[PDB]
Every structure is written in C-alpha cells, then in structure tokens.
Amino acid sequence: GPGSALKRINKELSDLARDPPAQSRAGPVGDDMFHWQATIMGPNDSPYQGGVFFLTIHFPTDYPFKPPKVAFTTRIYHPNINSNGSICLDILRSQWSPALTISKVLLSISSLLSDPNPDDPLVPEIARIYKTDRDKYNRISREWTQKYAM
Amino acid sequence: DDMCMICFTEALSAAPAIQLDCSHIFHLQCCRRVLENRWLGPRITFGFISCPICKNKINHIVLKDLLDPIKELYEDVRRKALMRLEYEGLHKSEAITTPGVRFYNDPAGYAMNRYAYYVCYKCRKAYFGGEARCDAEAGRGDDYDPRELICGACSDVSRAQMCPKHGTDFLEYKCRYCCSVAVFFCFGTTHFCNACHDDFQRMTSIPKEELPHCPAGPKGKQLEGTECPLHVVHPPTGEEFALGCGVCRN
Amino acid sequence: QIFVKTLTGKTITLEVEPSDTIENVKAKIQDKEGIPPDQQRLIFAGKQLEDGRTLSDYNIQKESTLHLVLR
Numbered sequence A: 001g002p003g004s005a006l007k008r009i010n011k012e013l014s015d016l017a018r019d020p021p022a023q024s025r026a027g028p029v030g031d032d033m034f035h036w037q038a039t040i041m042g043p044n045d046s047p048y049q050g051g052v053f054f055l056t057i058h059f060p061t062d063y064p065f066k067p068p069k070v071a072f073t074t075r076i077y078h079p080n081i082n083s084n085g086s087i088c089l090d091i092l093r094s095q096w097s098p099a100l101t102i103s104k105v106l107l108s109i110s111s112l113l114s115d116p117n118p119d120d121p122l123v124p125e126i127a128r129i130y131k132t133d134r135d136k137y138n139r140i141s142r143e144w145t146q147k148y149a150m
Numbered sequence B: 001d002d003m004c005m006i007c008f009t010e011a012l013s014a015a016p017a018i019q020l021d022c023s024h025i026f027h028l029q030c031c032r033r034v035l036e037n038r039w040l041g042p043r044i045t046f047g048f049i050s051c052p053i054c055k056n057k058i059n060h061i062v063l064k065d066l067l068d069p070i071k072e073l074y075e076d077v078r079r080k081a082l083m084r085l086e087y088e089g090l091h092k093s094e095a096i097t098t099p100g101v102r103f104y105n106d107p108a109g110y111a112m113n114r115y116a117y118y119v120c121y122k123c124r125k126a127y128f129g130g131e132a133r134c135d136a137e138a139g140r141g142d143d144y145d146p147r148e149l150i151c152g153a154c155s156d157v158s159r160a161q162m163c164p165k166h167g168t169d170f171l172e173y174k175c176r177y178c179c180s181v182a183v184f185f186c187f188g189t190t191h192f193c194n195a196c197h198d199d200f201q202r203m204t205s206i207p208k209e210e211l212p213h214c215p216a217g218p219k220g221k222q223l224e225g226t227e228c229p230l231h232v233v234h235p236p237t238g239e240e241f242a243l244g245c246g247v248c249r250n
Numbered sequence C: 001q002i003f004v005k006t007l008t009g010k011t012i013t014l015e016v017e018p019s020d021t022i023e024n025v026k027a028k029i030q031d032k033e034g035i036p037p038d039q040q041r042l043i044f045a046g047k048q049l050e051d052g053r054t055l056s057d058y059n060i061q062k063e064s065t066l067h068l069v070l071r
C-alpha cells in the first residue's frame, strides 16, 4: 500500500540523482521518504537566470495514483505561481498520469519559468504586466530574483 | 523493457497483465486502480481514462465493469456541456474555429474544459457548478466531502417553479453569499459557491446587511457597477434563491 | 537521426541533418504523431528551443533526446 508508494519513490530517487534533469536537484530531506526538497535553477534565457529556487514536495500514500503536492518556498514573480508558492500546472491536477515522475514535474516547472502562460493566470496582475509590458516584467522578475533567489 | 509504465515498480512478467485496445500493456491490477480512483478533487474530469502513454481512451473487455459507469458519466457531461455551450452561444467561438488552437473543431472538448461539473450525491447525475476558475484549480485536493455536492433538483429549498421544456433537470441555485452559481449544499440548508465554501466560517458570521449587495463577488467582495453577474433580479445577498433552468436563460 | 521523449515516456524517432530548423522539427513531429507545432515546446538540456534556429545552433548531435511538453 504505502510500501508500494515507497518502492516507487525509491525507484524515482535512484533513477534521478543518477541522471538528474537539467538544472534541478531533488531528494528526501530526512528519513521520511514522502517529504522531499528540490531546487530549480532559473533557466539561462529567462529573467530568473542565476537564481536558485527552492521547492517543497509531499507525496501521497497512494503514489503514483495521485500526484505530489509541489510548491515554491522561494518567493518568485511569475503569472502562474502565487505568493504561497502554489503552481498552476495541469499535470499536477487534472492532467496527472502515474507514468509521470518527479523528473518530469521538475522539467515541466522549469519550462514554465522559461515561458509563462498568461491566458489563464493564477496571478492576473503579473499576467497583465507580462502581456502589456515585457521589459517591465523582466526587470521585476530579475529584481525579485536578486532579492529572494540569490 | 518488461517494465509496467503505470507503476514503475515492476516488470509485467510479475503478476496479472493485459494489453489495452490502444496496444500497450500494463498490469491488470494497475489499470483497475487508475479507474477506481477516477479524478482528483470534486470537479469531474476525465484525464484519468486516457492511456498513460498514447492518451487514447483506455479500453478492454476485463475493464468494462469500471469503464461502463464512466462512459455513461462522460456521456452525461459531454451532453450537458455541449448543450450549455450552444445555448450560451459559444460554439462558433473563435477558440473552436481557429485552426491549430487547442480545440479546433472540438466544441465538446472546449465546453468540458470551460464548464465545471460535479456528481450529485442524492441522485447520481452531473450538474453545472460554474465556469472553471484557475484559483479553484490550484487550491485544495480532496479535503472535501461528496455529501455536500447536490444538484439543484435535490436541494430545492425554494420549492421552485419548474421549467416547462426541461423539467428540473437544469435547475441551479445562487450562492447564498454572492452572485455566482452554487456548487455545494451544506447543513442541508445553505448553498455555497466554490470560494465562499472555502471561507464558510467567515461568510456565516458576517451580518446579513453587511454582506455585499448585487453585484456581489465571492468571499465578501463588492463588485463595481450596476449589472448582476447572473443577469437576474434576485433577493438581497444572504437569502437563498433558485435561479431557474440554466440553459434557458443562458 | 534523433529521439523525442513525451512527458509520459512515449518515445518517437526522426531522421535529421544538423542544419534542420526547430520550426521544421516541430513540423516533422506533426507528420509522425500529428500535433500542431503551435501547441508543442521542445526542451533540450533545460533550454526551450527557439523556432527557426538550427539544431547545431543548440549543439544537438547524432542520437540526442528532446522532450515534448505542450500547453
């Protein structure tokens, strides 16, 4: 049951740190194998460049039939991540498949920083700035990157 | 390899396995769990029935017991959604008629994306719960109680005058506290929209005359302006009100 | 020749010459599993590939792996 979820979490870990996804680290933070920490580096081409961003990950008892709870603990200026570090990502909600792995989530989150989605935004203010004034969006993103993520 | 691509815990060689109509192969026992769990949270979605891999619907003789009630719910919802989209006059919508956008030529697809449906606990049919917000879609998971989801007909607190065309099949209520279609029905008396339910402790406490008046947003906001979001006359915020049949005014 | 992993593991194969623009690799992607270039992103080594750059713009060599993520 949870022993099943655990065998799967250990597999994902072993698979991971022995072939990490580009610009991310992730792993258990204690002896509790259901609670992970992760980092995503700001992608090279983005205003987040050079930032290190910390995430929290909670795996459910019936993984991977339910997705993990994933959040930012680093403050970040982005249309699809709120001030609580909640991420608007389909594959974490309605579009979750048990075929997905943490590698794929982190890769997916990283892409989201490379390229935000303003159309159905979680923070409609930042969404607006992005669509109307890009120069501004970068400045604030980089500025936030400098305050919070370096 | 011989790895089961649902639970990466295995080679298929290990226990009961099956090949879906789609072609690729999984543990029988894994496919069943995927189909028993259904969707995440209260709002009916059908992501879970596609193939982990090729994302064509999962199909098999051995799985018909699970798939059968699902196809019927999917049918029910596709039906209700597509109807609502047409009535709402959004089937000609540009997000359907533009080649290379997500739901090009997919009116049903667009509508089921746009609308939020819930399984009623009393009867067992889907009912409409409003446009799907993003804010609800990065909120809780299943820290919710299915007994509190109840279609308009099963929560008729306003002994409402039925629609001659569609009986009570598409009857919907206002949130008690704002100008939104309701989703939940708690303490067998009180209809709440998604946001107000989240915050029901507060909402219940606010004195009735201190609530926002029409036009009223969730969680106590006063929306600017003069036209009601529901395009209806209704009693002041804080009183129950049956909105009527959902298709026939939309 | 190079590969393309979908998020959900499904791998697909393409014949390509270096100078191939990622424009037409998104196109050559449609020809096989039939998705609109306009919905698909390509990720290589954590870089989101820009439409109309070559592959050896990105140092993509014989038998490399990209990832298709889509909105």
Ligand SMILES: *S[C@H](CC(=O)NCc1c[nH]nn1)S*
Pocket (backbone or CB within 6 Å): A080, A087, A088, A089, A090, A117, A119, A120, A121, A122, B133, B134, B135, B137, B138, C071
């Ligand atoms: S989590 C948030 C919704 C969102 O960010 N995106 C929805 C979407 C649909 N197609 N592309 N993005 S409230």
Ligand SMILES: [Zn+2]
Pocket (backbone or CB within 6 Å): B004, B005, B006, B007, B008, B010, B026, B027, B030
């Ligand atoms: Zn399995």
Ligand SMILES: [Zn+2]
Pocket (backbone or CB within 6 Å): B020, B022, B023, B024, B051, B052, B053, B054, B055, B056
């Ligand atoms: Zn398949």
Ligand SMILES: [Zn+2]
Pocket (backbone or CB within 6 Å): B120, B121, B122, B123, B124, B125, B150, B151, B152, B153, B154
């Ligand atoms: Zn009912």
Ligand SMILES: [Zn+2]
Pocket (backbone or CB within 6 Å): B163, B164, B165, B166, B170, B245, B246, B247, B248
């Ligand atoms: Zn009617």
Ligand SMILES: [Zn+2]
Pocket (backbone or CB within 6 Å): B175, B176, B177, B178, B179, B180, B192, B193, B194, B195, B196, B197, B217, B218, B219
């Ligand atoms: Zn409300």
Ligand SMILES: [Zn+2]
Pocket (backbone or CB within 6 Å): B179, B214, B215, B216, B228, B229, B230, B234
């Ligand atoms: Zn109103």
